[PDB]
DNA sequence: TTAGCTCGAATCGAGCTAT
DNA sequence: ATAGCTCGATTCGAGCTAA
């Protein structure tokens, strides 16, 4: 039939068939950009739902592997004894005043990282708030690790505009934030047309490539990036 | 209107194989055939972060708390013994004939056509400049791939085995025939000579290919390398495989064809950056770089096209490149 | 002379002239936009420079008031009585549950109003990292006071784009946050001459308007909006 | 607008072997070529409660309870023989030459641009320097990591085997060479030429480096730990493994190469440390900190970055760093 | 089968230890002899 | 919701200016 | 840093189809 894509991914079919038992086959092969990742011989009485759910499950563990890969690193709010744990905070960075640590009694509570060799300082609920809020990680910075560091930089003399698959991570459907493209153009107060320029295929003469402002803030309002 | 066949499987010509590698001392190399097989062993690897970070990882406590924390592995690594300074390399190539015969083809006529250009190629210039160029590819130790690199001195010895027993021996400098420049050698136009006899069909070729490098005392030798599954823990994760046939280190059958495939100079770029394997769209994955572009009419698709189906025959090193990728075999043809 | 521009302020001089004493003299009148608020007689020797310190205090006046009257609302974090404040923030909504409240000791910690009549929530150390995190105000915060609600709403339909004089409050010499055109374009990650074409006033042709997620990402860079 | 290549590989120079560790009697290392291996051997550890408590097992019953279940395990230990004090160690290093060109390069103009930096480089000021400092490393026993820090007498030999033999006999005495000051002596220069000629590509060098260490009868040695798996018995626990290749207690070549790399005197902070390894961000693994932060401007890629894109050439020190870096050699570039 | 030096009665060489060096509550000479002596026989002193 | 496409109008970058 | 310009290329909105 025709390749079926869901956000980054796409299933495309082989061009010739074959006859697996007495019934007509094509090879279903799953693609993350360039990275093939799994083929299926699937009947060619399949619809395309039937196809993307032989796949689902393996663009799910995808999903899961992602997670858990990028996941932000979190810090920890301790007492004096540093044993129980008062409050835990996913932070996008880590603070620059962190060194190695074991806490005190002479400062009431010690904000540490959850890694096993634990770096921290002391800290007051004034400041533990205000590094949490300038610190904290957005509900998907999961994302930001699947895409390069030179589309995700504030540095506007270092920054390349997104192209179209790595627009699709975080657009589409079937992407990873699960907003449609619409919603997205209503976020940054675009035209659906316009936006729909910006993740067009190759195979199209019309392509916007998105500004520096539109793709922050697109980052910002869709919960990726500098969201706390 | 002779439309291209819907399949174009070729089969594989100059197939060789896996190639064994072992290890002993120099000046005993004529007696090399007891030598102890390179073993692959493990080892323990601690390093830190030396790639570039996302710009988030910049941060210095992540960076430092990266260090604090170091990724562990344990790898194969493949060693000579630390009483022995030669690496020895032995594999075996069969030459067959019948190149421009597909193994699979879906078009009477385009595979007479196809065959009436391979068997006028062969009339007008035969496989003595391929031949010439493979010979120089087993003369220049290229299958040492990274075994040759900081070599001291590196020799090979090609022996041509006609009923089980040498028929004729060569013995190359291995370190004085380069790997940029295809010269003229009276040993070399021998092997050639045997190599296009055995691409003209016209003679059984079986060769014993057989190579000894100064790499160093107990000095690190490279076989080929495996995937990994990734199956395991972060700690022990053995992050490097490497290959060993039965219990011997050694090097892939088709990195040794990649290695004697090296001759394409006619690429549309400057040959001053080397010869490289005839490939369609002349790919090389180490540089990044597609030389013969389809975008320019140099590639293999195009050229084999026109000089077929449009009679539009390239220059003589361009049908050279195709008649080389016809001889390494692929599955060619659209779908 | 010239009429001093320094941010959303105007310090025009009048046509005519007079002469108080012996040496010449003119009517300096400072403006707020459409709003009159002094008139000083200057003699004409003063260069711009000058007529701008003769001015400058009305204008650190006027910004003293517009930072206390617009300041955000306060948050206190107190034990399970009341007295001692643990930890405040600046918030630029409060919370949708709070509720009329005196803190109890069957509760440890409560987040109370810094207004008498304290509304307050039982909340745990996490809850109350997370509420800093979402409801938190930026340090410039109190600007949004001086510009109109519709052009800084986040609904893109009942947005209106913010014309010279409203974008001269948050960029220029002589705005509320002291950042140049150069640099507020380079956080907008475009070229100073487009900016100057938004910031750009009377001069009809070539004047355009700023869009959506660029106002709104520039509000996110400079500390006023969008910050918590 | 040459903007950096995203595959920016490159293999590493000075290229050391596992270091192997045999045992004897000082006044006879002249004779040390028969000098009987020393092997990994098994003891059995018991301990008690030593580290710190998380404030909940500091209760005295519970502590007493922890004392009377000790942790019995079983520990690789390499000893020396009672009657022999002295320590040989003997690997073999190979210096390349080639240190500015990748290994994998996606821009050609990039490598282009790159290469003509490191030739400046080396016209400006060749591998002189580096190599001195080099030779410095191998002539004090930084190799012999924690056999030298008790060790009365530290004498390194290393030898210059051209074919098979040996062309150059240097023989050191590794503490009037300290840990700290990169002097200059008529041996040391000698070296240096030595590994300058080897970095250059002017010549092959192989050196055998053996270094004997004064410690003491049945005195501990300790080379190179490996990894546990952690899945037997906790009474045959076995927390520390040795490295060893045929029952000869051997150090990993990485860390033999690792304490060789350690010429960088030229990062921000003071010089209490003295020099550290040139690695990218200056990681040190026993600090946990890293010098040379990407922050302070003054990190491999940072400085890299500057020198060959846009023509901002450090100070001669820093280019030393940068030089020494890709001597070192690593996957640079956006992965 | 005991512990003399119980970390409750302040006499363990950890607590002696963080008083010396961060609080700068040096013991007596005898208690700082026995910290130097447990800096003498080594350690993997140092939890997280 | 995906996936595009004209068509005139407004915007964008990089050149110059002026004060 | 302010203030403004031109000019060709790129973006932008609101129609539309196509599914």
């Known amino acids: 039939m025709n390749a079926i894509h869901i956000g980054p991914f796409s299933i ?94 002479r400062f009431p509570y010690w904000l540490l990282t959850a890694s096993r060799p634990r770096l921290g300082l002391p800290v007051t609920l004034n400041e533990y708030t ?85 793709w922050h803030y697109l980052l910002d309002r869709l919960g990726v990036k500098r969201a706390s | 209107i002779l439309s291209t066949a819907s399949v174009l499987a070729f089969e594989r010509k100059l197939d060789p194989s896996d190639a064994l590698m072992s290890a002993g001392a120099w000046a005993q190399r004529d007696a090399s055939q007891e030598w102890p097989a390179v073993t692959v ?5 601690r390093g830190t972060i030396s790639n570039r970070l996302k710009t988030k990882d910049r941060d210095p406590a992540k960076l430092d708390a990266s260090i604090q924390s170091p990724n562990l592995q344990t790898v194969d690594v493949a060693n000579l013994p630390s009483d022995a300074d030669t690496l020895k390399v032995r594999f075996t190539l069969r030459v067959l004939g019948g190149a421009g015969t597909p193994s699979a083809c879906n078009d009477a006529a385009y595979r007479d056509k196809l065959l009436q250009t391979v068997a006028t190629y062969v009339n007008d210039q035969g496989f003595a400049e391929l031949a010439r160029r493979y010979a120089h590819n087993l003369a220049n130790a290229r299958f040492l791939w990274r075994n040759r690199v900081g070599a001291e001195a590196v020799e090979v010895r090609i022996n041509h085995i006609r009923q089980g027993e040498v028929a004729r021996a060569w013995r190359f400098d291995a370190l004085a025939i380069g790997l940029r420049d295809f010269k003229a050698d009276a040993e070399l136009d021998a092997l050639a000579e045997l190599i296009a006899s055995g691409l003209s069909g016209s003679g059984h070729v079986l060769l014993e290919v057989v190579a000894f490098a100064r790499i160093g005392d107990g000095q690190e030798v490279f076989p080929s390398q495996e995937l990994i ?53 002349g790919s090389v994955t180490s540089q990044g770089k597609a030389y013969r572009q389809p975008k320019q009419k140099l590639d293999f698709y195009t050229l084999l096209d026109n000089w077929v189906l449009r009679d539009e025959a390239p220059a003589v090193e361009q049908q050279h490149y195709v008649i080389a990728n016809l001889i390494r075999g692929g599955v060619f043809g659209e779908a």
């Open chain 1, 12 to 105: 495309t079919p082989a061009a010739r068939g074959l006859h697996y038992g007495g019934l007509p086959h094509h090879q279903w092969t799953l693609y993350y950009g360039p990275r093939e990742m799994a083929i299926k011989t699937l009947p060619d009485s399949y619809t395309s739902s039937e196809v993307r759910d032989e796949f689902s499950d393996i663009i799910a563990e995808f999903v899961i592997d992602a997670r858990h890969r990028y996941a932000p690193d979190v810090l920890e709010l301790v007492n004096s004894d540093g044993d129980a744990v008062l409050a835990r905070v996913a932070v996008s960075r880590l603070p620059e005043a962190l060194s190695g640590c074991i806490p005190d009694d």
């Open chain 1, 130 to 214: 205000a590094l949490a809020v300038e610190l904290s990680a957005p509900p998907l910075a999961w994302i930001t690790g699947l895409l390069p560091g030179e589309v995700l930089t504030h540095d506007a003399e270092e920054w390349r505009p997104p192209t179209s698959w790595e627009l699709r991570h975080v657009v589409g459907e079937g992407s990873f934030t699960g907003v449609s493209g619409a919603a997205a153009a209503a976020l940054l107060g675009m035209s659906a047309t316009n936006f729909r320029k910006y993740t067009a295929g190759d195979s199209a003469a019309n392509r916007q490539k998105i500004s520096f402002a539109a």
């Open chain 2, 41 to 45: 062993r493990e080892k323990s690897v």
């Open chain 2, 229 to 281: 599954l990734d199956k395991g823990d972060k700690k022990g994760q053995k992050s490097k495989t490497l290959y060993s046939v039965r219990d011997a280190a050694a090097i892939h059958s088709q990195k040794i064809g990649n290695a004697l495939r090296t001759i394409d100079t006619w690429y549309p770029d400057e040959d001053g950056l080397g010869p490289i394997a005839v490939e369609p769209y």
